[PDB]
Nucleic acid binder design. Structure first.
Lengths: 245, 190, 30
RNA sequence: AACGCGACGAUACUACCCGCACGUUGUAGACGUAUAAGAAUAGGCUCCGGCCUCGUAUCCUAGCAGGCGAUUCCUCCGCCGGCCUCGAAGUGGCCGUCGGUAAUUCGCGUAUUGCAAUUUAGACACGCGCGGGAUCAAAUCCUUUGCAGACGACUUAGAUGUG
RNA sequence: GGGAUAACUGGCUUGUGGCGGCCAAGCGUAGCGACGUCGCUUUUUGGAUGCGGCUCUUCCUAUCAUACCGAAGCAGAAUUCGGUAAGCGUUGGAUUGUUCACCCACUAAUAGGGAACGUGAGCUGGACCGUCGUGAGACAGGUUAGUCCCUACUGAUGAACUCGUCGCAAUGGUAAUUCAGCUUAGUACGAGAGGAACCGCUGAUUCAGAUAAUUGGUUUUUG
RNA sequence: CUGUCCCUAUCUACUAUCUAGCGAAACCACAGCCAAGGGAACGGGCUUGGCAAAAUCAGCGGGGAAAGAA
RNA sequence: AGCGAAUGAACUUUAAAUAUGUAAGAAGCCCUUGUUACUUAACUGAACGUGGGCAUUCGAAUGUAUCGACACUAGUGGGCCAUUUUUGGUAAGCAGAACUGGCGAUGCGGGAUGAACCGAACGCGGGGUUAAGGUGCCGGAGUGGACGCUCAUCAGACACCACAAAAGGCGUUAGUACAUCUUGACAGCAGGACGGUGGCCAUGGAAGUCGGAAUCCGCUAAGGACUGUGUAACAACUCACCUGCCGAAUGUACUAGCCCUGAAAAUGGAUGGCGCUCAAGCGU
RNA sequence: CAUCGGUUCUGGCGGGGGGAUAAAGGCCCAGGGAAUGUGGCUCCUCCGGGAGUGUUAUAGCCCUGGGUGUAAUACCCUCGCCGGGACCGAGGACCGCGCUCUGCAAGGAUGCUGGCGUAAUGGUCACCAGCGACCCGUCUUGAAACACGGACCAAGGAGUCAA
């Protein structure tokens, strides 16, 4: 009836994909299944998964899928009667959560050597336990928060003042410069964002990202792979404990 | 449409006890004692499990179910207050005239008074008497800031709003005169 | 409010069309 | 409020108070004119057993319009005294005395109001009589005043005095 | 000359022009069609008017000022627009037959209306006939219409209740208004020029209720 | 100085509470408290509300007076 | 209605609704032949007569409270309102005909009140039953029964004519159409939101966001040569879109009731007054 | 007060007929189904309970034909029989229609009884109370409204006579 929210019609040049992209994913998985011999299942648990473009540019000659897990599970076939190959329905239990496929004509030993040598320092992301305690120095705050030496540092942009205040830093504008208390220091004590060995929340994650300090490590973890020739799965070490489907 | 049944549930923690009368709700815990009347809303209270209170309504309308949700949230707010309390951190900013905020507690009436002086150099001293049960502290943690803690969320927030409203500028430019005493952070004590 | 609703409905239709897609003054002046 | 109310002073008679003999006196209307918790109603009461739709309940209710007498009963009413209580427009409790009193049963009287004729019966108020106690008042006119004034009205003063 | 009509508006009136095209949910299955837009009025350089005026009561708000708000490159100051508000107040000139417009002076401002066809109360500044005509009017020719009491309000007495004193308060009316100066402070703010506000203090204007110390006026004190 | 206004002075005229006695006239259906409604720009009696207390004295600035229409 | 009948309101087999004129018996029709000054080629036609036919349902129904003729006598010559039909006009008012009904000269019940509204017309009384209209006393009779709707900062209690429309309502109920969802719908929380490319012209500077035009490709899960915030430019944030968690119905437009606004002045007053809120309002 | 007549209001009781010879419904007889799925069982970190699966089993239910059955009841229409109340009693020898015919409820109320026999009933004035109720005439008009006459009382006072 009446008394309802008014949803805004956005002036947007892109609309909702829906079944067009759904069928494009479906046909893509069908055309990808027979081309390449091995289908790896990998997982990204709590990462910002933005380095997938770099790993794709590295594996130009391999095709990685990371989309909707239930769509990909049915596309590979969760039952013995809809499967392209005999045992892809075995792989559709390793396909459980924030997981993806990776189709190759390359060798396992090489691919897990790659994925064990791959690791990139990235931003915290919610849920991670803080490996250290970060506290911005008392005084004029810079664009680093007392990690880089200040003598080689740049003052922070003044347009983040409302955002830092919203996230909860008692910061002020003195003569165009963002500061904690007084410009010459003293005044008050510092502001700690997160303490070591303590679960960090979304507010703390946003503060960390704005100050551009990374506290987490991005590494893709392989749950298990599939070889179509022998028609066999291979539980990878990680997949052992991961809540299978 | 006269929905036959509607229900909501509110869990309670181990370290509180909730005595609910006809429609008086008293909640006790480590923070203290807190009582509220809700006789204005038709609702049936009961116990469903060991530590959940079920509040139900029968033969009501959407307005009745909305009132059910509101009183659910109110009871939960009292539980949160008696467990963890509430805390409002404010900070006062000024340009050329420093604001002098003096907080005192009198034995009479058992309440707090906050006196604000030198707000835009005004010669009037602005005194706000607080709701019972709220504590006011000029902390030596940050400069020119205040903490308003308490057990009743409504009292804490209304006191903060009263101080914010009393220190307001008149017949000046808002974009130019930025001074005042403003709420900064809202949260729980523990 | 009537003017605003007509304007917003016309804007919605025009934006939908353009998202899907991918002389009297002269005589008087003379 | 000139037809709203209270407190107090003095109240000659008339009758001020008290008791009854009452009244061919009045009444927008006796006939058991019987009954105090508070508060809530999506809760309440309780002796703490339990109880709550329901006041279609409790009390009370028999005797010539209610006699006389008797076995039995200490139950229930009424009046006066003492101690206290009640103020929102003023009452109730306790004790005491005295009077009346079927909870059970019985005898003597009802008659004739003649086949019904309101079963004249209550309350407060007022009025006429007695016999007990108590007191012996004011206002207005008149003269005067000017704090008042069209006239009224008002503030004043006339009894022995600071007249 | 004959006939019809003989007053008139009365949940009327107010802020947004008309004409034509385009679009146009619909109705319909060509015709009606709102809001917008385009064209005309309409752009490439900065006197009109032909019954008026003054005093008092009451009411309205469609608010001029005062009180409180929202918005504005609103630094300060001075303001503009809008909102709640009728409690309180709301001039004098020049000119013109009169009024308005424009212009000029004090002021906080110097708003607009109703009292219901008689604009609350008070005051002030012709048509018929006849003669002669008619390309046209004229007649000292006649006739003729022109309607100290009750009640309200303001005060003052009052019988009944024994006179008197001392009180209560149903209901009814109701009241305060504006400006300026000192301090804040040459501070806040501002490049400069300029330049506030709350708290505190003191006066003045209007209105209202009293009063005769003093001062001025009055004289049948006929002193 | 004035074909202007106001005030002071003089004259002319009309201007007067109560008591004693004497003592009319005008006019008069009956009356007289208000608000809304009473289709016929009509209310004074009707509807329904406000209300509403004897008998009088003085003041009076309100109502009890008006059109007729091209 | 049809045109699987023909033809094409002007088509028809048939035929609506709606009012309306005339006729319905001895106050008769014919047929038949006598006359005529009419007429015809003619006893041939027309008129005037004869005969017959049905007196019983004698020629539908229903009422019938009698109808007709002549003579004479008194008061009357106005209209106003409304339904329907009909001609014309305006922005709206309205103007003119025809028929019928109400008022005249008419009391009574109801509409609180009343020229035009509803019921019903009349001697004096008694009893009963009703009409219209009502049943919360004023006020006679229901705080009657059934199912629902509405909360109005002067509702409504029948005005629906106006104001008033393609009107404004994040008020409330019922319904219709379309669309998405365990292939995880709406809302939310945690993330991505990338490369050519600071794309071309212009600007001192303009890198998606002061301006003009097109707006492509890859990567895809998806990302616009970008919806907003911001910088001198950047940077940064954010939207669109996408994935994880959650878990089951949503959301877009109309329609129909009730409610608010949809414009108001001036002495204090009016659903008749009180007052009324699972009504003492609205529909059945 | 009893028994009658007329009008009338109101309560109850005994039958008859009709629907689909009501539709339902009880109890039996077969046949067929399902789920808001009973009993089993299978699960589930179970105060508790859920979920699953399947067609009577340790509940049942729906549907189709059949018997009891011409069942009962509702509704409608009908034939009667009792009970309570109100108003009225017109006429005055017989005649008539009748009947339940010694008689009668059949062309209109008699019988028994009580108190009073006088202001008791009845009546007239004045007052109260409830309800109702514009000030008469003239004139105009379709009608109002306005306008005109009306201080009161007594007497006089206006369609006559003649041709």
């Amino acid at each position: 009836p009446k008394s309802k929210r008014a949803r805004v019609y956005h002036l947007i040049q892109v609309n909702k994909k829906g079944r067009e992209a759904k069928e494009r994913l479906f046909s893509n998985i069908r055309e990808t299944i027979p081309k390449y011999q091995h289908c790896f299942v990998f997982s990204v648990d709590n990462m910002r998964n933005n380095y997938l473009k770099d790993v794709r540019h590295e594996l130009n000659d391999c095709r990685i899928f990371f989309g909707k897990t239930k769509l990909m599970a049915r596309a590979l076939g969760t039952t013995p009667e809809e499967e392209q190959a005999d045992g892809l329905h075995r792989l559709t239990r390793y396909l459980t959560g924030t997981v993806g496929l990776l189709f190759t004509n390359r060798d396992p030993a090489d691919i897990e050597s790659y994925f064990s040598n791959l690791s990139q320092v990235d931003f915290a992301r919610a849920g991670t336990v803080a490996p250290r305690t970060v506290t911005v120095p008392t005084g004029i705050v810079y664009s680093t928060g007392g990690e880089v030496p200040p003598e080689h540092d740049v003052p922070v942009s003044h347009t983040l003042e409302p955002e830092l205040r919203r996230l909860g830093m008692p910061v002020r504008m003195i003569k165009g410069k963002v500061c904690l208390g007084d410009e010459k220091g003293e005044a008050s004590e510092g502001y700690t964002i997160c303490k070591e060995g303590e679960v960090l929340d979304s507010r703390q994650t946003r503060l960390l990202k704005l100050f551009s300090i990374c506290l987490s490590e991005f590494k893709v973890s392989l749950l298990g792979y599939w070889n179509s020739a022998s028609g066999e799965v291979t539980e990878l070490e990680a997949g052992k404990t991961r809540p299978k489907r | 449409m006269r929905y036959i049944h509607s229900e909501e549930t509110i869990p309670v923690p181990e370290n509180l006890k909730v005595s609910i009368k006809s429609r008086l709700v008293t909640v006790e815990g480590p923070r203290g004692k807190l009582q509220k009347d809700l006789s204005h809303i038709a609702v049936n209270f009961s116990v469903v499990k060991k530590g959940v209170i079920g509040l139900e309504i029968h033969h009501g309308s959407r307005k009745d179910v909305a009132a059910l949700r509101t009183v659910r949230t109110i009871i939960n707010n009292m539980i949160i207050g008696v467990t963890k309390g509430f805390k409002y951190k404010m900070r006062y900013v000024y340009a050329h005239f420093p604001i002098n905020v003096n907080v005192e507690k009198n034995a009479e009436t058992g309440c707090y008074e906050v006196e604000i002086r030198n707000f835009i150099g005004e010669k009037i001293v602005r005194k706000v008497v607080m709701a019972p049960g709220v504590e006011v502290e000029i902390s030596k943690a940050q400069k020119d800031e205040l903490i308003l803690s308490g057990n009743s969320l409504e009292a804490v927030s209304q006191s903060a709003a009263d101080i914010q409203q009393i220190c307001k500028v008149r017949n000046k430019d808002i974009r130019k005169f930025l001074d005042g005493i403003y709420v900064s952070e809202k949260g729980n004590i523990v | 409010r009537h003017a605003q609703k007509i304007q917003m409905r016309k804007a919605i239709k025009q934006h939908e069309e353009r998202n899907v897609k991918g002389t009297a003054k002269a005589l008087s002046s003379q």
